[PDB]
Amino acid sequence: GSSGSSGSKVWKYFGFDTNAEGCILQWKKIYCRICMAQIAYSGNTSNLSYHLEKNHPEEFCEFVKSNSGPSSG
């Protein structure tokens, strides 16, 4: 999933920069560079955001830009 991305936005924060004999980069492993934390990847990028929603409330907002009527929350 590299050649042809719709609009990956929830990745700029969680970017895995690894390269070596093992090249774990291939595996499904993600870590928050911002807080040098480790966050496993799930079926979808649902946790990716959640992590911030609680961790970094500043980044979450900037990433949470919905253009529509207000929801309960």
Pick 45 or 55: Cβ nearer Zn ion = 55
Q: How far is the CB of 34 from Zn ion (least distance, A)?
A: 4
Least Å distance, CB 66 to Zn ion, is 21
Going by C-alpha positions, the residue among 68, 67, 30 that lies closest to residue 49 is 30
User: Under the rule (CB under 5 A), what is the footprint of Zn ion?
Assistant: 32, 34-35, 37, 55
What Cα–Cα distance (Å) separates residue 71 from each residue in 6, 23, 34, 68?
25, 42, 29, 9
Cite the annotated binding site for Zn(2+) by residue number.
32, 35, 51, 56
